[PDB]
């Protein structure tokens, strides 16, 4: 239909959802949050597949590390807006790193399966099946702790 | 619930929708489009209300003009993605300007009514009622000339 206007509408629903963070964050914290989020969203524009998922493994050694720091930086805001304890506080440093890897693995697998829904291990290329399964296990463990 | 992750998911539905433009635009044209669209989206971030609608009347004379040029720049891409003729081509220069004004009026009225749905003139503050009604009329006229 009007795919052009639908593009603007999608962006507006994103704006609306983002603005809800103000319910829980003062303007100082909200500005830091949106400044960090912009890094992540610009990366999805530049590097995301057709669904904005990023194949972290295909990035250069430096860009992957940079993208990882951005995610570590944002995790406390996400945890707060999700009503969870801060994973960066509950997990050991080691574990916090494994958590970011697990998140990146999950996103990489969304790229490989081209799926935005619940990933089904059948569709996962064999190079990523074990990695995924472990990543999923580690995420549920982190989940129970926050 | 998980409003944090829901925020990321909303952004990704946007990403997905925007990537569909590649179906109809080669990479050079898509890169120009996304470059121009970033201007508009950064303005919604900075100036939008809670729904990313911008109150163009509340901008300085310069900023308003800049934002208008951005819109005029994007209209041909939107027209193309909407399967329509180019409004910039079908309309006279005068009319194209009026068209941009009518689009801004509509957006301003979404701010004033705080409504993302079909605006109802009842809810529109009196300062904007006539302006809106005319803007709506002019948009249907433009619409008939490009669909
Ligand atoms: Ni929860
Ligand atoms: Ni149409």
From TrEMBL, chain A:
<feature type="domain" description="DUF3600">
    <location>
        <begin position="1"/>
        <end position="145"/>
    </location>
</feature>
<keyword id="KW-0812">Transmembrane</keyword>
<keyword id="KW-0472">Membrane</keyword>
<protein>
    <recommendedName>
        <fullName>DUF3600 domain-containing protein</fullName>
    </recommendedName>
</protein>
<keyword id="KW-1133">Transmembrane helix</keyword>
């Amino acid at each position: 239909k009007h795919a052009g206007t639908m593009t603007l509408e999608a962006y507006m629903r994103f704006s609306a959802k983002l603005s809800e963070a103000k319910d829980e964050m003062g303007t100082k914290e909200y500005e830091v949050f949106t400044k960090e989020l912009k890094k992540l969203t610009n990366a999805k524009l530049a590097y995301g597949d057709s669904n904005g998922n990023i194949d972290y493994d295909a990035l250069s050694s430096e860009k992957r590390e940079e993208m990882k720091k951005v995610s570590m930086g944002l995790q406390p805001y996400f945890d707060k807006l999700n009503g969870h304890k801060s994973s960066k506080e509950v997990l050991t440093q080691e574990e916090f790193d494994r958590y970011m890897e697990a998140l990146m693995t999950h996103e990489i697998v969304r790229v490989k399966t081209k799926s935005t829904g619940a990933i089904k291990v059948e569709e996962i290329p064999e190079a990523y099946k074990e990695r995924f399964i472990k990543a999923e296990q580690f995420m549920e463990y982190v989940d129970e702790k926050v």
